[PDB]
Amino acid sequence: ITLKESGPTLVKPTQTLTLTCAFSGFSLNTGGAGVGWIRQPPGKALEWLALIYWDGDKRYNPSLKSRLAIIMDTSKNRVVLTMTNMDPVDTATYYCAHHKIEYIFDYWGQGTLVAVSS
Amino acid sequence: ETKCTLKSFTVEKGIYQTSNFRVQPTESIVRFPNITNLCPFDEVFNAT
Ligand SMILES: *[C@@H]1O[C@H](CO)[C@@H](O)[C@H](O)[C@H]1NC(C)=O
């Protein structure tokens, strides 16, 4: 199993974050499983970001609906996480992981860190 | 046996007859055909 995360290291406050995570090797004949994204900045604990299942459902934390978008390739290659109109406290690292319901996060990705250039 | 088959306590000379010589088996062997065309209960319990 390999899940690699790709993204910029420094971004503008008026830019858009375009993170990607690519997974290699899963049992696609299942239900309730999918791809999840979680955020971590230094100085405070973990904060969950988002979930996608295999059927294309698109969920985030509440009251963050406008500034979060997902692109699915529909070819089992990579998942794209896009943010607009950032907050400078969110200079943080990203983990993309497998997301089950009993396994809260099944396999942990390496993740990538980003900070604002302002 | 040659006394009990004549209901007598004395038996004369000569060749008589008794029960047969029976050989009994030991175990049972059942070989019906190899399983095939398994019914698709596996796909319906594992259905997405
Ligand atoms: C589902 O398939 C597995 C093998 O992947 C098998 O062991 C199991 O008996 C099947 N039935 C279930 C649990 O639905």
From Swiss-Prot, chain B:
Stretches for region Disordered:
22-38
User: What does the annotation give as the result of altering N46Q?
Assistant: Reduced viral infectivity
Q: Which residues are glycosylated?
A: T26, S28, N34, N46
Function description: Attaches the virion to the cell membrane by interacting with host receptor, initiating the infection. The major receptor is host ACE2. When S2/S2' has been cleaved, binding to the receptor triggers direct fusion at the cell membrane. When S2/S2' has not been cleaved, binding to the receptor results in internalization of the virus by endocytosis using host TFRC and GRM2 and leading to fusion of the virion membrane with the host endosomal membrane. Alternatively, may use NRP1/NRP2 and integrin as entry receptors.
Q: Provide the assembly information.
A: Binds to host ACE2. RBD also interacts with the N-linked glycan on 'Asn-90' of ACE2. Cleavage of S generates a polybasic C-terminal sequence on S1 that binds to host Neuropilin-1 (NRP1) and Neuropilin-2 (NRP2) receptors. Interacts with host integrin alpha-5/beta-1 (ITGA5:ITGB1) and with ACE2 in complex with integrin alpha-5/beta-1 (ITGA5:ITGB1). May interact via cytoplasmic c-terminus with M protein. May interact (via N-terminus) with host bilirubin and biliverdin, thereby preventing antibody binding to the SARS-CoV-2 spike NTD via an allosteric mechanism.
What protein is this chain from?
Answer: Spike protein S1
Q: What is the lineage of its organism?
A: Viruses, Riboviria, Orthornavirae, Pisuviricota, Pisoniviricetes
Describe which stretch of the whole protein the shown chain covers, with first residue, last residue and complete length: 298 to 345 of 1273
